[PDB]
Every structure is written in structure tokens, then in C-alpha cells.
Amino acid sequence: PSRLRKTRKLRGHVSHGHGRIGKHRKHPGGRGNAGGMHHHRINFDKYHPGYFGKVGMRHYHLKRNQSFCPTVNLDKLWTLVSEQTRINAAKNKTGAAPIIDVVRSGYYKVLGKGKLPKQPVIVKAKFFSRRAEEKIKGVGGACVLVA
């Protein structure tokens, strides 16, 4: 609201919070980000390092859907499944290893972060990490690829 604004408390104050030596003229610095090279260099160079200049390689008409690839960590794999299918395991005495279709929960890749519960699994994904391979293998379980 206008009610709680410092512009109320600046009534009867001549300069209105802008100082009477150097008044609030219109545009003293420049207009916008203007003068990155000249006379604003200390800012752009000490707060935005790497602003000015080209780098890398042009890829004209990029489309994100080509390179779309979400990721899961093994940290939260048994979250994609209802936790009861995990409780209907570590039990059942048969080596059930329920199937987890990482594709169905919207992830085209499984990465190897975090601990994994000592439990057999079948993980269907598109692209695996190497360590995510070894974490599932070493727990006892398979890595199954899907197209």
C-alpha cells in the first residue's frame, strides 16, 4: 500500500531522500546496462566475471526435445514404486526383485547417487551410469535397457 511507504515520511523533508548536494537528476550513469567497457567496468568485471565476449560453438536451431533426459539417483528409486512393493520383498523368500520402470515415472536415465537398500531389483531405464550399474549389481540385481 501507499500507506506504509517511505514517501509518506518524506513530507516536509526538502530533498526527499535524494540529497541536496547532488540532486536526483534524470539519468546520471547511463541508460540500462550501458558502459560495461567504459566507466562501469569495475562493476561488470568484479561482479559479473565473464560477461563480455564470445565462447564456444554455434548450434543453430537447437531443440530441447532432442536432448531431453531427466535423471534419477538411486537415493530415491524405491520412491517411484509404492513402498508396499518394497515391504512385499526383503521377504517372500523367492528373490522377487520387483521391476521398476523408470520410464513410466518420467526419467530417461538412472544415476548412481547415494546408498541403495540391500534388496534385489530390476531397473528398466534408457541410459545408466557406470556407478549406478555397480551399485545395483553389487546389491544383487539386473540393469535392463529399454528403447
Binding site: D45, K46, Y47, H48, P49, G50, Y51, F52, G53, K54, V55, G56, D75, K76, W78, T79, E83, R86, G114, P117
Partner: protein, 187 residues
């Protein structure tokens, strides 16, 4: 005719919750009482926390609450958080806990009760142990906010890595004069 600097004689700390929620103002009325009376510094910290801001009493995940209760000796005590208990999907072996908090997210509420645990509020905690006897005070990581990354020396000063504010990160967004030794210099 005295010659002290009155610069920083007034101490800037919160002595009342800046919020208006009557509930927080009520158990503040409770530990405005306990804190003055009982010798326990416990509630003097609990009181001095009930004032603080959301941004200053961060949420405590449930797993960080386990490994701080698993330590040798603090078995049988109660976890006490002036804050909220969140859930941790990346943890499953939930031991039985006795927790107190202002809030407990609904999911973490069912993980705790299902494990044969108990959750209290800061008024039953006043009746359990008014002195705070047999408790464990905890908190979430206050240097956890993503804000704390943009703080520090500066980005672009020598070997002081601090995240800069960029409208959107990418190839052509701040990898130039100052970042690659090939283009100007680098720090």
C-alpha cells in the same frame, strides 16, 4: 560532557515475535514465564528461538534427525526442534522417536507414528520436562538456503568461488573476459 560513542549502544535482537499468529504468541507467553523462572538455560534457548524468522529456523529433515539421535548415549531422549520436521524420501529404517516441533509435515507425521513413535507440541513438552530434562535441541542447516551461495567475497576476485546472479545459465552466459584464460584473463 561524556565521551562515549552511542553508535552501537542499542542492541538489535528480537524480543518479541514479529508475527501475529496467536498460537506462537501463546506458547511464547508460556516460555516468557519458564525462561524467567527455572534455572534451565534450555527454555532460554527455546524462547530465544520462538522469536526468530522462518528464514532463521530452517526445517529439519527426518534423516538428519536420525543420525543426530543415533549417536551413542542420546538414546531415550526427546528431539526438540523449534521448526518443522520434513520428510526424507531417501531414508527408510525409521527408528522409534519422540519428537517436538512447531509443525510436522503430514507425510513425516505418518512415518513417525507408524514406527511406534510419539510427537508432542511445545506445550506438552512444557509438562513432560519443564526444565528441558532429557532433551536434544537441534536445527536444520541455516547455511542451507540457496541464497547463501551468492554471498561471500565476490565472483571475479582471485580464487573466491561464489555463484553469480545470471538470468539463465548456459554456454554464452558469463564464460568470457574473466573466466577463460584465453579470453582476457581469468580468476
Amino acid at each position: 560532557g561524556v565521551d562515549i560513542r552511542h553508535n552501537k549502544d542499542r542492541k538489535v535482537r528480537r524480543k518479541e515475535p514479529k508475527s501475529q499468529d496467536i498460537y506462537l504468541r501463546l506458547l511464547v507467553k508460556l516460555y516468557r514465564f519458564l525462561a524467567r523462572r527455572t534455572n534451565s538455560t534450555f527454555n532460554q534457548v527455546v524462547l530465544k528461538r520462538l522469536f526468530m524468522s522462518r528464514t532463521n529456523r530452517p526445517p529439519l529433515s527426518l534423516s538428519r534427525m536420525i543420525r543426530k539421535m543415533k549417536l551413542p548415549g542420546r538414546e531415550g531422549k526427546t528431539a526438540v526442534v523449534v521448526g518443522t520436521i520434513t520428510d526424507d524420501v531417501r531414508v527408510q529404517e525409521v527408528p522409534k522417536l519422540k519428537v517436538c516441533a512447531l509443525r510436522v509435515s503430514s507425510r513425516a507425521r505418518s512415518r513417525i507414528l507408524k514406527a511406534g513413535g510419539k510427537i508432542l507440541t511445545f506445550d506438552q513438552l512444557a509438562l513432560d520436562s519443564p526444565k528441558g530434562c532429557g532433551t536434544v535441541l537441534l536445527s536444520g542447516p541455516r547455511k542451507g538456503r540457496e541464497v547463501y551461495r551468492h554471498f561471500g567475497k565476490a565472483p571475479g576476485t582471485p580464487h573466491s568461488h561464489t555463484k553469480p546472479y545470471v538470468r539463465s545459465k548456459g554456454r554464452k552466459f558469463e564464460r568470457a573476459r574473466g573466466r577463460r584464460a584465453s579470453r582476457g584473463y581469468k580468476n
